[PDB]
Design a protein around this ligand. Sequence first.
Ligand SMILES: N[C@@H](Cc1c[nH]c2ccccc12)C(=O)O
Ligand code: NA
Ligand code: NA
Ligand SMILES: [Zn+2]
Length: 866
Amino acid sequence: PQAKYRHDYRAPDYQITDIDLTFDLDAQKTVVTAVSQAVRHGASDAPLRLNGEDLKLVSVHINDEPWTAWKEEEGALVISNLPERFTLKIINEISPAANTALEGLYQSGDALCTQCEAEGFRHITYYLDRPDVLARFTTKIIADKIKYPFLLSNGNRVAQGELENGRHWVQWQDPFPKPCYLFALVAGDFDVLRDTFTTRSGREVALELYVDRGNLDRAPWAMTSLKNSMKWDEERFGLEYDLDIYMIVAVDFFNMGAMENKGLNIFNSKYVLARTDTATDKDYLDIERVIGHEYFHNWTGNRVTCRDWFQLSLKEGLTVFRDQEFSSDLGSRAVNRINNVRTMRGLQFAEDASPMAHPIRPDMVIEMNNFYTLTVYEKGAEVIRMIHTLLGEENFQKGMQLYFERHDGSAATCDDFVQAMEDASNVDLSHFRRWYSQSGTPIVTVKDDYNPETEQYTLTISQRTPATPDQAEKQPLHIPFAIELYDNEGKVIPLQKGGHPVNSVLNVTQAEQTFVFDNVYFQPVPALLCEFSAPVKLEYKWSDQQLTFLMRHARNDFSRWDAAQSLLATYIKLNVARHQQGQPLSLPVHVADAFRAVLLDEKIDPALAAEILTLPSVNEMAELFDIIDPIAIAEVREALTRTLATELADELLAIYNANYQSEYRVEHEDIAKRTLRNACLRFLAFGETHLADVLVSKQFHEANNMTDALAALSAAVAAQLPCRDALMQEYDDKWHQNGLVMDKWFILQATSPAANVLETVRGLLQHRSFTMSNPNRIRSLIGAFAGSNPAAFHAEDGSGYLFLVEMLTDLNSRNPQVASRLIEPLIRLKRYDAKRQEKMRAALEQLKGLENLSGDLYEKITKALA
Ligand SMILES: N[C@@H](Cc1c[nH]c2ccccc12)C(=O)O
Ligand code: NA
Ligand code: NA
Ligand SMILES: [Zn+2]
């Protein structure tokens, strides 16, 4: 497999302006007829090079003349000796039923559906499968009427007819030129939820949600979320939907989350289907986020698309930023920010420290499907958010407006977007652009001094980004570094110098810099990197008392949570070192006291309290350490939970009881109380065994919603309570027919602290609700074990690695995209001790030797073994 390079970008030799597709659909053999209007832009002797994968070519015509001047080669059809403008007609066959990779045209249950991003359309026909080629599509679909009564593609229905032998057809036209990755086709039999949204300017939009027969009871929340998304994009960004119909199809078999195909989004059913007895608060909020995300792509991705795939973050960073802003505006901004920061520090930082490290705009890609990453998406959003911090909302929106004005109807670059922001705002972003080209996580070190003689406070701030495997050279970035200074009363000290106010967002642009503030009338307690103002590691020598002071006094809820994280980090590190020496947990009394105060504080938002009372995950804890000890981390997390459960037992029960809610509502105040109550339950499960078992079993059985039922079941598994097996069996018996609900149970099985977890996981490969044919099942059982049970995955006997090798040997052939998701825990080997590294290296070497090794795995394995 050959690497492709961003610096090799060249405008295409040919454009296609219009394509008319016909599908004669059948699961075994689909015939595709594609009639494209092409125009040569390059040299008169340049051949037309069409991408194609696994196609059976039937015929090639140019202006209806059977063409003799062509050859097929690896991944391509190369057509020579063409006029400047011509009609290309290709007929080819494909086999949806044979498509286990779920890219191109494939089967999802009884339905046929497509996935074309990034380079899936070339699995359907020979085409210019590159996103800077935009064409107007029309799509004719011919199929068996009984099997496929609904035949959907992008845009509007313009023709329909009936044929002999029980077949029918529909033709669709989408007026907006698009790259082929935004093409979609769906055929099948569905229940349809229909509704309407009227845009602010009065365009009435038909909304249609297609779900498997029998699932209409689970569709209204997604529909509500769609309307919410449409309204928000109007209010916040001034953007209206631009077509007459908005279709969403929920499919059970899907490699990712959802796909923004113009006017015909295709969603993993996990991000559509919800009922109060099947879905948790988190599921509801995820459906909201993902519905919003795909909707927001209509402008940031569709109306303006990507010139090439190295520009992926142009749409993904900006659309993730938009979905976060949406969720934050509608819900708790603090809880959203907190959770997004947990993801950055606990998951994205790990990727940036790994062999797969890349800038948000990559320079080199072998398999583009490998680059739909925490970096491109989540760090991409942090970079957008930094622009927002630097510009402020008004200038940011001016930048958005200039971006659309310039680039609407075209494929653009990351640099185009940055230039629009810079030009609209008059803020210089030339240095800022390095965030697009540099990989790795900057470390920002802060030292301070208070001078009582002069009433000056001095911050000396330094930065460095360690070298990464992809980049030997690193340079200083433009880091927006937000601060707040507090006096002894918890009041904010005005920032000023030489008689002028100073902006609280410091521009940290050098390797080292000093900032001096005057009229600092009392020695301050600083709040540093407020609202996680840049995606960086902060090094500052906090005292415990400074941190508990911030937990009490900090103005923004994020700062209060973040101070608690810094307080915990010190004692997590302490207790992991202790674990390694065979010593039990040690925690100062004043630390337990800070958490008691949070529990008992009547004024604190329960949403905030709940997050402070949610310990960092084992993945967040891992990032505190150069070399990860996953067993020590897991056991310390449990010991810390048990210690707090004992110290806080009375308070935890009081708050648990106080937050009881008889009515279940998917409403932010109720969700916040429930999140707090269940945070309390988690500790209570790890307290005195009989009371724990009673509380947990009672909640599981009395729950009137899945959030409370699953919180109880999860606690029973985590604390290995007596009731565990009975409750787990009860859930299986009730829910085994429901794959999405069973995913929750597979996750609990996979992440269990039980000594025999791997045995159980292997046995579950035979479970009635599990199948290797479904990405959701695979991720919930196998992915959760390897990625979310590092203590078991990294068992000292190497059994976890051997298990994953077995699974990846299957998935490499079946579904390389899912295989490549699942190999990630193995490529982290350099973070582990020598003995583990050698077993992980052996595992990777076994996979490297596989017959028919996918490009997806090849790329990751070679980087890991380098
Ligand atoms: N474009 C989708 C992501 C996606 C869905 N399916 C895919 C398959 C391959 C690559 C990306 C995807 C999004 O970010 O909203
Ligand atoms: Na809000
Ligand atoms: Na100091
Ligand atoms: Zn996206």
